[PDB]
Write a protein that binds this ligand. Sequence first.
Ligand SMILES: Nc1ncnc2c1ncn2[C@@H]1O[C@H](COP(=O)(O)OP(=O)(O)O)[C@@H](O)[C@H]1O
Ligand SMILES: Nc1ncnc2c1ncn2[C@@H]1O[C@H](COP(=O)(O)OP(=O)(O)O)[C@@H](O)[C@H]1O
Ligand SMILES: Nc1ncnc2c1ncn2[C@@H]1O[C@H](COP(=O)(O)OP(=O)(O)O)[C@@H](O)[C@H]1O
Ligand SMILES: Nc1ncnc2c1ncn2[C@@H]1O[C@H](COP(=O)(O)OP(=O)(O)O)[C@@H](O)[C@H]1O
Lengths: 67, 436, 445, 435, 442
Amino acid sequence: TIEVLGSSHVTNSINNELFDPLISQALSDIPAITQYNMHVKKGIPVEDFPKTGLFPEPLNKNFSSNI
Amino acid sequence: KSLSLIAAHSHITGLGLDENLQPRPTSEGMVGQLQARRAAGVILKMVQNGTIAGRAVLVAGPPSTGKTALAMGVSQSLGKDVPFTAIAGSEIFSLELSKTEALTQAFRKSIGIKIKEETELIEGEVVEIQIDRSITGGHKQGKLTIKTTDMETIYELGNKMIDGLTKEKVLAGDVISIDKASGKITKLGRSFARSRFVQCPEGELQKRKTVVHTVSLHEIDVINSRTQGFLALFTGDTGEIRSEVRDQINTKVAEWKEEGKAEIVPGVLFIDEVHMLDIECFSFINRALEDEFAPIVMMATNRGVSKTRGTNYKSPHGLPLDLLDRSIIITTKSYNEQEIKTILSIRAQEEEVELSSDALDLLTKTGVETSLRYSSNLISVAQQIAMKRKNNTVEVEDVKRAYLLFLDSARSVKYVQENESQYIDDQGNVQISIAK
Amino acid sequence: SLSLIAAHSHITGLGLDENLQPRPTSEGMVGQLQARRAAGVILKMVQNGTIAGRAVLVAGPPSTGKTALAMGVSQSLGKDVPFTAIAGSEIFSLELSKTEALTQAFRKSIGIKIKEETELIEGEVVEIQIDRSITGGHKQGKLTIKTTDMETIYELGNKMIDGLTKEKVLAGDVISIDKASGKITKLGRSFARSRDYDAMGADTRFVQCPEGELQKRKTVVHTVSLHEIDVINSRTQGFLALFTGDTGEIRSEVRDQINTKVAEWKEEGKAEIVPGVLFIDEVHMLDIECFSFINRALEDEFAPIVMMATNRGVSKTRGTNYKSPHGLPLDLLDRSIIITTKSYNEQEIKTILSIRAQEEEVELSSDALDLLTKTGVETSLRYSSNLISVAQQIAMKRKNNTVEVEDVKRAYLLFLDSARSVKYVQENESQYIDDQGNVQISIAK
Amino acid sequence: VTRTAAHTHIKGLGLDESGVAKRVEGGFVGQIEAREACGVIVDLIKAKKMSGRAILLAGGPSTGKTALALAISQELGPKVPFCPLVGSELYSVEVKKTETLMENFRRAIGLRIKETKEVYEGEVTELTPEDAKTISHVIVGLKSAKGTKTLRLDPTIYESIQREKVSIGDVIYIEANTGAVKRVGRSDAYATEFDLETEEYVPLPKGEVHKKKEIVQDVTLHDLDVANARPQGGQDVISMMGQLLKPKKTEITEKLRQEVNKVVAKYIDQGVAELIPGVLFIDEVNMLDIEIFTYLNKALESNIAPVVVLASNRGMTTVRGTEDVISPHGVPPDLIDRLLIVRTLPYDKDEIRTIIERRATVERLQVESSALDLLATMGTETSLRYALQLLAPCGILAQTSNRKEIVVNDVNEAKLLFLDAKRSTKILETSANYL
Amino acid sequence: TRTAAHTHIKGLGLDESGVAKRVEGGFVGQIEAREACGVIVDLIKAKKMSGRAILLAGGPSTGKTALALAISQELGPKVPFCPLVGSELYSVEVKKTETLMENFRRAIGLRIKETKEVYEGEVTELTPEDAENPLGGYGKTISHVIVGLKSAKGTKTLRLDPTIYESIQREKVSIGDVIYIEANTGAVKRVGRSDAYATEFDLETEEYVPLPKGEVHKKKEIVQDVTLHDLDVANARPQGGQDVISMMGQLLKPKKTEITEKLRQEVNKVVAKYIDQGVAELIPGVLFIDEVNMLDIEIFTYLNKALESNIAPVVVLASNRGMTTVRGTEDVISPHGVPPDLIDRLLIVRTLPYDKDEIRTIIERRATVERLQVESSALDLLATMGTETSLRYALQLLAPCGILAQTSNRKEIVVNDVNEAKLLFLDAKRSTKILETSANYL
Ligand SMILES: Nc1ncnc2c1ncn2[C@@H]1O[C@H](COP(=O)(O)OP(=O)(O)O)[C@@H](O)[C@H]1O
Ligand SMILES: Nc1ncnc2c1ncn2[C@@H]1O[C@H](COP(=O)(O)OP(=O)(O)O)[C@@H](O)[C@H]1O
Ligand SMILES: Nc1ncnc2c1ncn2[C@@H]1O[C@H](COP(=O)(O)OP(=O)(O)O)[C@@H](O)[C@H]1O
Ligand SMILES: Nc1ncnc2c1ncn2[C@@H]1O[C@H](COP(=O)(O)OP(=O)(O)O)[C@@H](O)[C@H]1O
């Protein structure tokens, strides 16, 4: 963690870099009921969705965690 | 902080000098070597004055004669907040950085920028937190009763402070420090309430404190180069930082110095075993020593009239004559019986070893016979041999048993030259069989 | 411009006749009649284009004009013919093999020529009207583009609508549309709307409003070397490898499919083949492996004409432990023809010095020119060439415009040649660091 | 206060209008002919017409070669580029040495650009965007202590404004030419909406909202080469964390160099750009390999190559990378034929004394004349550099006994503590076990 | 028409069941080496043995590379042939052992045949037919998709799965476009738009492939020729995947990697399984290495290891050295720069120098290939020139003679033109005499 005392711009930029919404959306997936709310209830087309599900699959279910 | 078991130079706390830079016979763990200690004190005054730059000092002498001890004493008497970069000669032959780039990084790690700044903090003891929440989480309301040992107050809290207090959960009885500008909340612990443990703070809640930062030039060089972040300061893949950003940092540092926003501190770059460097390193040092942003370089070596690496001729101290023209030389000398006895007594007091007098005389005799480091190494083995037979004081036969068990250089050479048929020579011929 | 007075910028082509007979002094070249005639023969070999894989070698003493002859050949070659001029030390890389670097240098020197037609509609957008159907599967577009003279209404497809929604134009931007291919670009914003948005931003630029005819037709010619196709068909986005050099040992299968497809393109009639020249200056310091690869790679149909230059005598070959003529093995010297240059005399040195003084815009007297000619007779030629340039500044410091003999004498006294430096080093050998690292620093004994 | 490191008493060459050197001027003592030759070279570089000219100045160690190079760089001024280099810096582990030499060649050609800076800064009092899902334009109102000003903005800058989380009451910073938007923080007028908040509070700007400024940008050709030869791609404006995959240097092709030259040649003719050639200085040229020595011959024949200044302190020495090539100054005879050689002569006793006095003046020390004669005798006996580096210990030892002035006994004490190379060699030879 | 040092040879020129004749196929002389190369060609065409090695040795300008290229032309274009130089194995990305194994696997080919059942053409209608009982909570439940296709001299309406309509929507298949559906996979792909729907809009980007010939439905048997190295680099690299690593590596530099023996074993066993099925044919080929003295003893040792493999092809080596030290060793004296361990494992073919009449005939053929006309006395003087200096020097002095003949507005080379080409262009011996008799760094 890099800290600069007395500035909110550094905290905002650090929180933007650590939790970039495009990359964090790319490495995960939208829930199905949420997708149904976007496409049918809100009129958003399929191709206007952010790109999701780019995380590589693990070998097993046992290899997916360190616990 | 700064965990450490016992080092070889851990008994040295600084150069033992008076106000006239005269060396005491025994002070701060350093005995003997009066002229070398006085010269190193003059070098320390050069560093503390800071008005001159790029001066090279060579420390040369026999092995095991107070060279690294002198460097450790100079580093201890420098104190904290002044850069000191102690590297070895074999540490710059890298695989991802060139030799000149590694030498440039080691040069720029020893010049610091001093910046003073002020920040305001709220360090206090939480009496009561009241949180009002809605069903959907739209609007949050918050009351915070917080106090010191001197005051007491109640604060209305906005939504982002509610989010910052819910995250990193603060309960009643805690001692916390809040930064208003950045929103960083740190739990110092719990107060003295039996019903870890710290003391409730005193004075005003809203304090304003001045902190002093010392940032090396290499850190600003890494930060200003946009291709890599600050993590290369920890991971180490800086990777051939260009000279343009070095020029920008060199201009901006002088711009800050003229405006009075920052200050220049110079440091010491120590190169231990300097004879292992290549000729291209010496040719780089010959031009890098003449910069304004150049520290004081102390080099230690023990070679005498050896081959310069990268060439085929022989030079004094393993260094070429153009480098030796740019240096002043401090020369060390061998030790007497009394100084060896005093050094061994200091090392006996350091490792919590109780010694008899006759054992100390035997150690001094075998120290002036073989080596200083051999008697400095026997003194802790003899304590374990003493503790095996359940007594505290190390006696004469305890030293004799360790002398019998553990050999030195000359006896090993004698036994090898006596029974060389059982070892592998240069030609790779050995005899493993006993008969015939 | 971005070109200063170089070492040999006075050479503009080879000074030959129509019967390949060299003039005594024309097009910047003085003397060297047989070498210029042989270079004209090699130039006609390149311009014919029916032959491939031939090796010449320009051998001579230093300061004779081998690279001057190569510059004359390159200047008389003309445009749109590839001329790849490299040195000997360029092929030693850390992430490319010597064989692969030589392969890239060989395939940079032969190109193909492709002709195409362009129908440009370049103008400022006035209004885009998008019509959507009830089903929405098909869309129509009314485009109002304009110039300073005429404007018209164009019909768009759905792919126009998708391609203009991306890099979105805002009714007042300058675009240009192709008809045969449908190329879409956004050149920038007009100057008529420059005082509209009060702050331009990061990703905008201002261009003039195009004038004249809105419709334009233009035939353009492209010359693409085979190395560009090799780089492009090796990655997904390969032009970054074209401009950064991180191609990294391109495989052989893509090379043979590109050879087969360029043979098919020549047979179809779409493109034609332009062979060129690969010049290697100071060829003597290449490894023996590079020579092996060269005399095997000179036997292919897609091989350019290789001009190698060297000035070594009977010297050792790198990678081995024996000596050879010109620093080249006899296997490579078997497959070569040698052009030998000859040293100059007083008159040719005088003419070359006069040409170099005219090129640098320096006016000399007759006595100064004769003194510089005598100095170039005794010393080398490049020493007199540099002496002219420093004597010009010594002349201009005196508030005098022509170079006199006093200025030449002052420039001779201030700056030393090789022989006087050798004499002054050998007379004062104790003050310099010798081969064993010994030096007498102090002036007193 | 002030830092002195082996230089900074050298202010220039100290020549008059006719180019004749004074004896003691500009911090230089003696050395008339080399200073006159360097002044002629400075005039040739200021003429701004020729490319690829080379100069080698040779002499014994501690004679003034690097001081003359720094005097040339001071005589040219800070506007003209000057790239100092050592011969050992051309060996890298990421690219070949020829690429490093070409990069250092193109680092010495600069361009001067006339630019304007336009700045709006103040409190956001009105933030109204209007469309025609896609916004058309946003009207932004700014206020400072001298008044208010309203602006229209495009949706592109509005996206960066929304990305910066700018609301009503924040003090912002908008650059008109670049479109960069910076948020400073909330204002002190809204500091009492809550008792505790995470927002930093800044006062209103005292000056006017609109500021204009004329600036001059200096950019080398290697900057324009490296701005277009990024292998990974472009980077954002603010990034404290680096990219995950490490970008290393690459062998930049000549096609990119030709296109950069085409762009610069187009920009020069419009009067926006001004071209300034400079100096590439290479000290210790004897450390160069024969391959770099060969590539230097090709690099000196280009149309855009700068003036190269080399230095060497060797005699008849074998060239590195070769076995039996004995040549003067460690330089092969091919490159020497393209060079002009300036000789450097050693000093006598009185010039050594004057140099010691000049260095003692700039270090703010006061030396007795009898101590100065002893220092001059020591400088002639051992080395000039040994006499120069013994001034600061003499000053410290004089300051120890509460004196502002150097006595002979301080010189003797500093000679006793610190040795030169000759006495160290004498101790080295008559020793038993590794000194 | 481009001629470059070769392409005057069209095979070896042997007759059937016999020996080489004196002049045939661009070859003059060298009867015994041609017969041995023909025997080697017949052995390669027998398609049984593996890992046989031929070293052909001789002086410079003798015809070793010409014999190797004649072998390559005699085999044909369907048999793989990998030319190589001994200096190409030294790469700075992967070790030379992996490069040698890659060039070993490049020389073995696989011929596969397959049958494709396709439906292609312009779409006439596209109707997703609804179901009789749609399910609640949904919309437009589809029972089947009716697609009509039209091509040259044939129209046909289809009846499809409910699933393919998703692929039709993802591939943006509208009306009037030309589609392509294979049978077993579905997987409609959009090959373009019809040319009858080209000029309704002034501006468009989409291409217009015309209507395909033949019927809408035809089974086509295709034959594909690959190599084992292609299968190795296709199985080693991943396919089109959704992970970030696959898309990141596809935009980065394709760095070569050490292919394991496990992947090669799996490739060989699946290839053997499909060969035993009767679908695939295995065609071993030739790996040719020129100037094998450039190899060091590590590559020679790995050649000793790899020539005893089960799958290795026929390797042809060329060298011209005599008693020479092997590279990488300081005191091993060996013939042709080849260590005796590899020398024991190969067969040596000796090649002999030429005489004056054969030099004259070779110059005649190289002149008649380059479309040149030479006088007889000039031909005899050129043959004498080739006898005195070199065969390659006489061959390379033909095009300057033709250019100098053209410059004098004549179409025939005469004695004066070859004397001018003699005086203008030098050979190795006279240049060496110039270098020896001069002392100005010449
Ligand atoms: N003046 C001294 N005071 C205290 N200890 C010393 C002194 N001189 C040497 N030593 C001891 O002798 C040992 C050798 O010293 P060091 O300088 O590290 O060896 P070298 O001279 O080979 O670098 C060290 O462990 C140090 O503790
Ligand atoms: N025939 C010629 N006409 C004009 N200038 C020449 C001629 N020959 C040589 N020069 C000049 O001599 C200078 C150095 O000669 P160069 O071509 O470098 O010889 P080399 O390549 O053998 O070193 C060049 O600047 C060139 O302009
Ligand atoms: N003419 C001079 N006047 C004043 N100081 C000089 C003069 N010549 C040399 N010096 C000083 O002597 C030192 C010599 O250093 P330098 O020139 O770098 O050595 P070298 O010539 O071996 O490179 C420099 O610190 C410089 O300040
Ligand atoms: N028997 C032959 N008939 C016709 N031409 C030949 C013959 N042998 C060699 N040549 C010609 O000699 C030239 C060089 O021979 P080459 O195959 O390179 O010998 P090597 O490979 O031993 O150097 C080739 O261009 C080839 O056309």
